[PDB]
Design a protein around this nucleic acid. Structure first.
Ligand SMILES: [Mg+2]
Ligand SMILES: [Mg+2]
Ligand SMILES: [Mg+2]
Ligand SMILES: [Mg+2]
Ligand SMILES: [Mg+2]
Ligand SMILES: [Mg+2]
Ligand SMILES: [Mg+2]
Ligand SMILES: [Mg+2]
Ligand SMILES: [Mg+2]
Ligand SMILES: [Mg+2]
Ligand SMILES: [Mg+2]
Ligand SMILES: [Mg+2]
Ligand SMILES: [Mg+2]
Ligand SMILES: [Mg+2]
Lengths: 97, 140, 41, 79, 159, 120, 95, 55, 101
RNA sequence: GAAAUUGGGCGCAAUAGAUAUAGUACCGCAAGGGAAAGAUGAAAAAUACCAAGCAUAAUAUAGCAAGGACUAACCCCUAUACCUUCUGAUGAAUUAACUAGAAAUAACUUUGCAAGGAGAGCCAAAGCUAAGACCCCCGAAACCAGACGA
RNA sequence: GCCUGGUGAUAGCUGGUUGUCCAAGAUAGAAUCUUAGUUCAACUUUAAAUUUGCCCACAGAACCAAAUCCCCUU
RNA sequence: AUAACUUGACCAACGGAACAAGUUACCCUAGGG
């Protein structure tokens, strides 16, 4: 019977955390800081998807050409096979054409 | 598992509260209880038609029996009560047959009197006076 | 404008009141249930 | 093999009688075909101009400020 | 694992009143992980289900099955704790109210899986003479039942 | 092949015997028909289904008024096996705006323009 | 066609399509007639006049050719002395 | 960019275009954005008309 | 429908009558009236000056939930609906009769 | 398919996440394949109620096992199991958990701005920008490369 | 041979595709190493613009049966 | 092929693959009757 018998511990959430209180600040650093930075230069993450959005085949292609030279061996290998699979899927399979 | 289903005891129990009175494993095993419960609900809605039908044949059995006690048959009673503008229905006639058998006897007398006036009227054909109970009340 | 004058009488705009312009968001159709998926289109 | 009862013959016959009287009442029109011509052309034209007019008057509804602001009431509280 | 039957000897009732019948004693005892199957214990457990404990002991001393000796140890043990621990004055004055057998935690032996079967044995003894067996119902009981069913019937689907 | 059936004109020519049978006069005929669907369009060709939809006889046992003109009579001749036709007779006049609400079409075929619910 | 290339992740044009057809900016594809330069010795001059024509394409042929090329080919082109330039904008349609 | 009462503007546009059509033009005000959307091209007539009105 | 009715009893009607609970009602359309030794039956209704049947509204309930399921095999055709009709209960107070023959 | 040129977590939380408590146990001559599982409490120097399956409690004329009912469980009446494949045989003992629709060219809807739109590149004879909204799971015999095997 | 890899091989073939409720919805064909499949059409669906559609009366449609086409009125 | 105009298949399996035969009771797999 996959249901729990006692109700779980309560989820104490601090809405006035440092992160929550200061979320969203400097999203308008462009439009009211004389366009010296874009907001996309505010985001932190992988180097191949800072200010870039793609589907999965494009994320894999971009990751391979941007960081693929210093990827580990079997990660590089898995990623080559994922591009090869996702190529054969987006280009040859589906409903609409 | 990002989001797997937590609230599944209650989906099962929505089905199985309807099966608690079956036999065998249909009362407990969702896979069996679903087929039987669906099938029970389909019977439950098609049985509304048969409830109405079977009440009516039950009433015709009771009116038939009670009118055979007075020598009439069922077509004679119903026909010749329509012809008196007594538009009682089968439910009421069956209930009068059981609970008020003098009213039912007098209705059988009114229907057999009308039946004989039908005979005598459709025997002596031509312009004649109509029967007394044969007269109709015109509504305008 | 009469419309800001409407905004006086209403509770404050918060992150709990917000709503997209009706017509913006078409709902996602996904293959679950009797209609959207058995052969799934 | 299926055979024909008295019910079936009497039923068939009363349908034939209704049919024969339909034949009778269709045997005496009130007008000739020359007389009826265009006697209802105006009402037919107006009727179709109404169909045509409801077809060509199709457009999105008006959008109001009061509806959009009235969504703010979902956090109306007591004091 | 649950162990609710051992705890049942720990219910304490509030003391009675002088204008109130004497409550009979109730002695819940069991044994766990008997190496025997639960459906062979069902016959031995079923055999003794309303007997006095002397009749139960006597019937289990002459039974050839393996479980009979185990149940006899459980009943002698429960007769002891009946008198020592639970204030039953007469050893003789008990009867078996409940005698069941559940399955125990079985083992699995790979040969090809084969289960090493275990079982439990649950007995409630109740202080008092064993209740008289139910008499077979007579033709008077059948006739009264039938006539009462005839008196019971209604005019159906009417007023 | 099953096709659409023409019916000859001798079928729609009354005889004085028929004027004795039904209640008709060849001189001064009736203006309005009452048409009622008494048979289903199922198991009938699609053209008869259409004519039933045009005449406004989708529901059975519901009377509909038509004109006794040769166009409407042509459509009625196509589906004359599904319908029933009687002349709309009018004992009193056609209803004025005073008697517009208080009418009732009786079973006889007449349309009475004063419909009380009292006995005579 | 290729919906996502392996290098760019872009759509690709089918170059057969470009090699045979002409996209006018209004959406009409112009083509040449099949067999306009074959077996001219056995064709009547009416038929040869019919084959030497620039023939528009169907609606579904047009949408099939739109899907097989990319947005580069759908673009305004202000050439110098273009022969087809008066046929780009569509005059005087009443839908 | 209609700022103010869009319903007066819908009444006045509807009174302006109906001789050029016979019928009242079928419109849609969008009171939120402050637009007014008429069916059929009347761009030159409304630009000239709004120059007459002084906007 | 035709209800056979005495005084002091109950009728359950399958629609909301849009009356307040407690309101008295004269039921017209009585078409048989019987006593022990005589009956009176109308063609088809009795005179309003002859018989008077009164009834109060007691309660205005809904029905028990009432299932409507459809199912066709091999077609993936399974609908389910649950319906509760409104109902009012009438208490027939009196059948008064009058000497108008 | 170029180039010139340009310039910590809206993660998982013991069938999940790593195969991993371990490359262990086990299987294989070997290369190699490859598991499962734990839950007290502050202190152990303090020993409930819920799956299927059963038991308490075997059975009573008759029949997809119910439904209409009914004073009444049965008796009366009505009722050719579900999925899938065909115009109209397949698979499933049962329970729990796991297990299958991924793409925004064009069109549409909703905003912004508008002869211009876009935070360069691009489009524009009302357009352009932004968003929303469309494209599944399992299953061969094979072929090739490199090892391990008499 | 067997193992690992390519490898989520490929499969026009088999099997399977998980909440609710409502709505609209079934039978011309042409090509194809094609007839276990696809493409176009036909039919189907939504949205949009407009103006006729359907039923049909005279007249009318060839020499060597039932009907149909056409078609104003209605 | 031809400077060009043009010309080029019994591509006859005739909407035409630029050029590929017999056989398997050793057949094999996926399916259908
Ligand atoms: Mg019936
Ligand atoms: Mg693992
Ligand atoms: Mg259980
Ligand atoms: Mg039976
Ligand atoms: Mg299914
Ligand atoms: Mg060796
Ligand atoms: Mg596959
Ligand atoms: Mg294939
Ligand atoms: Mg429908
Ligand atoms: Mg070929
Ligand atoms: Mg195929
Ligand atoms: Mg015409
Ligand atoms: Mg061929
Ligand atoms: Mg061919």
């Amino acid at each position: 019977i996959g249901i729990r018998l006692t109700l779980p511990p309560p989820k104490v959430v601090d809405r006035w955390n440092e992160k929550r209180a200061m979320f969203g600040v400097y999203d308008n650093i462009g439009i009211l800081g004389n366009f010296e930075k874009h907001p996309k230069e505010l985001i932190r993450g992988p180097i191949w998807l800072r200010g870039w959005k793609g589907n999965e085949l494009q994320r894999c292609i971009r990751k391979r050409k941007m960081v693929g030279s210093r990827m580990f061996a079997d990660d590089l290998h898995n990623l080559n096979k994922r591009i090869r699979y996702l190529y054969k899927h987006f280009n040859r399979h589906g409903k609409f054409r | 598992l990002r989001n797997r289903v937590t609230d599944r005891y209650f989906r099962i129990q929505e089905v199985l509260k309807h099966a608690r009175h079956f036999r065998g494993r249909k009362n407990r095993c969702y896979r069996l209880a679903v087929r039987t419960v669906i099938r029970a609900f389909v019977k439950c809605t098609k049985a509304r038609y048969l409830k109405k039908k079977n009440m009516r044949t039950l009433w015709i059995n009771r009116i038939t029996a009670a009118s055979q006690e007075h020598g009439l048959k069922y077509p004679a009673l119903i026909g010749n009560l329509v012809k008196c503008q007594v538009e009682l229905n089968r439910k009421v006639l069956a209930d009068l047959a059981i609970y008020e058998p003098k009213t039912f006897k007098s209705l059988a007398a009114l229907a057999s009197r009308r039946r004989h006036e039908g005979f005598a009227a459709a025997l002596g054909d031509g312009k004649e006076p109509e029967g007394i109970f044969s007269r109709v009340v015109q509504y305008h | 404008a009469r419309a800001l004058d409407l905004l006086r009488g209403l509770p404050r705009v918060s992150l709990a009141n917000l709503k997209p312009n009706p017509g913006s968001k078409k709902p996602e159709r996904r293959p679950r249930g009797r209609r959207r998926g058995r052969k799934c289109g | 093999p299926r055979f024909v009862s008295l019910r079936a013959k009497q039923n068939m016959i009363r349908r034939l009688e209704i049919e024969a009287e339909n034949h009778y009442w269709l045997s005496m029109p009130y007008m000739t075909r020359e007389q009826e011509r265009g006697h209802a052309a105006v009402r037919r034209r107006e009727a179709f101009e109404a169909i045509k007019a409801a077809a060509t008057s199709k457009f999105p509804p008006h959008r109001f400020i009061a509806d959009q602001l009235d969504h703010l009431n979902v956090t109306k509280k007591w004091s | 694992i649950s162990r609710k039957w051992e705890k049942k000897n720990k219910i304490v009732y509030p003391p009675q009143l002088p204008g109130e019948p004497r409550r009979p004693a109730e002695i819940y005892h069991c044994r766990r992980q008997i190496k025997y199957s639960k459906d062979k214990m069902w016959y031995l457990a079923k055999l003794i289900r309303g007997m006095s404990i002397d009749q139960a002991l006597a019937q289990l001393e002459f039974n050839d099955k393996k479980g009979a000796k185990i149940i006899k140890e459980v009943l002698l043990e429960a007769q002891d704790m009946a008198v020592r621990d639970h204030n039953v004055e007469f050893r003789s004055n008990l009867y078996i109210a409940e005698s069941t057998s559940g399955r125990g935690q079985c083992l699995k032996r790979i040969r090809g899986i084969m289960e090493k079967v275990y079982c439990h044995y649950f007995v409630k003894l109740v202080e008092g003479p064993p209740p008289p067996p139910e008499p077979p119902k007579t033709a008077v009981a059948h006739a009264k039942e039938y006539i009462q069913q005839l008196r019971s019937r209604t005019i159906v689907h009417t007023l | 092949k099953f096709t659409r059936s023409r019916i000859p004109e001798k079928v729609f020519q009354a005889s004085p015997e028929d004027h004795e049978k039904y209640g008709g006069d060849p001189q001064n005929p009736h203006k309005l028909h009452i048409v009622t669907r008494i048979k289903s369009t199922r198991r009938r060709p699609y053209w008869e289904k259409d004519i039933i939809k045009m005449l406004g006889l989708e529901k059975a046992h519901t009377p509909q008024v038509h004109k006794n003109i040769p166009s409407v009579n042509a459509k009625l001749k196509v589906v004359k096996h599904l319908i029933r036709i009687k002349p709309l007779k009018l004992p009193q006049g056609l209803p004025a705006e005073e008697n517009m609400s208080n009418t009732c079409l009786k079973s006889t075929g007449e349309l009475v323009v004063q419909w009380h619910l009292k006995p005579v | 066609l290729t919906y996502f290339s392996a290098r760019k992740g872009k759509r690709k044009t089918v170059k057969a399509v470009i090699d045979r057809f002409l996209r006018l900016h209004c959406g009409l594809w112009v083509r040449r007639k099949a067999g306009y330069k074959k077996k001219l010795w056995k064709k009547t001059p009416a038929r040869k006049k019919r084959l030497r024509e620039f023939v528009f394409c169907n609606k579904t042929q047009s949408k099939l050719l739109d899907k097989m090329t990319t947005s580069f080919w759908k673009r305004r082109n202000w050439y110098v002395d273009d022969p087809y330039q008066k046929y780009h904008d569509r005059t005087n349609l009443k839908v | 960019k209609v700022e103010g009462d869009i319903w007066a503007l819908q009444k006045d546009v509807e009174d302006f275009l109906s001789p050029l059509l016979g019928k009242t033009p079928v419109t849609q005000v969008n009171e939120v954005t402050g637009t007014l959307r008429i069916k059929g091209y009347f761009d030159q007539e409304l630009k000239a008309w709004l120059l007459e009105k002084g906007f | 429908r035709q209800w056979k009715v005495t005084s002091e009893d109950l009728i359950l009607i399958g629609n909301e009558l849009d009356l307040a609970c407690g309101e008295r009602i004269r039921l017209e359309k009585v078409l048989l009236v019987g006593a022990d030794n005589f009956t009176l039956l109308g063609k088809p209704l009795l005179g309003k000056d002859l018989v008077r049947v009164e009834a109060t509204v007691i309660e205005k309930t809904e029905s028990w939930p009432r299932i409507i399921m459809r199912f066709r095999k091999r077609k993936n055709f399974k609908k389910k609906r649950i319906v509760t009709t409104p109902q009012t209960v009438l208490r027939i107070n009196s059948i008064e009769i009058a000497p108008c023959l």
